[PDB]
Amino acid sequence: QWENSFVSVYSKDNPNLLFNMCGFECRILPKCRTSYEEFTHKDGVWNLQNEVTKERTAQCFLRVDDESMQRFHNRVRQILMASGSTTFTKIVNKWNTALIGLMTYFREAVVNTQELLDLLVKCENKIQTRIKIGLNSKMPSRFPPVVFYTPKELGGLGMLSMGHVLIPQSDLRWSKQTDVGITHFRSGMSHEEDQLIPNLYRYIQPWESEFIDSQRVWAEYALKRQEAIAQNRRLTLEDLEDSWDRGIPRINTLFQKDRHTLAYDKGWRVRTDFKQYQVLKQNPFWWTHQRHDGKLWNLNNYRTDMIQALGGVEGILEHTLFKGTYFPTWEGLFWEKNQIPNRRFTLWWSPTINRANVYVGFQVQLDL
Amino acid sequence: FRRTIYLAIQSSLDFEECAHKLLKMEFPESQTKELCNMILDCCAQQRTYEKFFGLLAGRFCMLKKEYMESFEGIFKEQYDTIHRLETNKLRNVAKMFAHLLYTDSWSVLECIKLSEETTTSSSRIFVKIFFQELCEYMGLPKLNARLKDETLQPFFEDNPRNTRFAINFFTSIGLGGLTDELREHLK
């Protein structure tokens, strides 16, 4: 049906070549057409390199397609709506899962879509606002970001947050046409102090780079096999310690113990696509599987940098009752490895939740 | 200062935003060496090459004349650690300078030399990559130009031996299409 289809045409009248594959909206502008000033940009710009001449002959811009954004938004709306009962720590898990589901997949294309950045910001504000509703307050002085962004090891919610970033804004009149650039920024979300929050996107490696890395890592790997052959000495761990976690197949996945069995598995990637029909729940990770493709991201840094930005262990804990427990240190804090756990979450932040300074309130003395 | 830089950079999408965030803060200028030293270290130390951290170092140069200088210095500062750094992070660097030098933030090279005399097998790989990246952009012809007007010596000479080391070494890299004239010179 012409209605569902789409067509683009490249001719001396039309420089740009548009198309849509999978979730990606792609544009392609050659340098042989009018590219005017040649320039780099954020990794949202791919360079298409002639295989023959090793030259950059054109540029592909990525943009996150509409229907995708729509799906994510319905996924957040699924988290809000489908949970009226569920615990607040549970929702934050739902958010984190969906959010990495978007970010690991799209990565570069996210930064070139302003509509996404907006949607993420408002949606973070909606789930945090909902957790606020969960207790009874909307009062900001009662929910400083330290409670949401503390990795729950220290008793926070461990919320992954992409939405404190500034949102570029310039010239709607011209920006609807000529791609003017950035003359302004809008504040995404509040910060109690000047402060900071780290963004997911900064800790994920872009798709372009992981591709080039993949090619190089594999070629070098074959070299490591050849040198091992000529030496007759088999290869150890150390000569592979360099590339250990790198490459799209994630080279370490060769060394999986069960590797045999997986060698006889085929078409896994399509079965994942059709699991949505066999199983009721909605898989965001449908595109890949860690067993064939490895783990394509490591967020371990994000936690450390998160704790640093909040002022260190002493920074986050300064919002808690910890000094009440009279524990000598927090180095030994160990947690309990429609009932209390919610109710407990309040005590732990109770110095922050309840404040002598608030916007509006009637100060009440508990009974005795 | 060193911690604020990291947090501002880890926070921001795009490379544009971190500079705005960083400039905005109006941290003291002289430090405009170490800061940039921060960016070069902070990502290069960071696990794999990412386009962002390399762009940032460069813009930070065009905005103030000194920032450019601050970088070229920091490239010098490498000589001491050309051997010392472990053999991953060279994979981030070689390219990572590749992207400042393809886009013009070349002759600063010349300081770098090819000798069995003193080159670190580290440094060997470092420079090796640097060309196998920068080539992949300019495509080995524009590179033919840039060299031919470069007057890079410690790289390109005397020392017919070192002309075997040079030219051979660029058969090893594999490009070796800018080694011609030197081949003639051997003869």
């Binding site: 907006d118 570029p168 804004q169 310039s170 003359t183 302004h184 920024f185 809008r186 504040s187 | 905005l63």
Partner: peptide
């Protein structure tokens, strides 16, 4: 001067609507 920038009104936006100008432009 709201120069066509910023939200019509920071009502549903999740933000405080604050627009400062790009401190690093050129």
């Amino acid at each position: 001067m709201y120069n066509g920038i910023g939200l019509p009104t920071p009502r549903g936006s999740g933000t405080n609507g604050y627009v400062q100008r790009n401190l690093s432009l050129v």
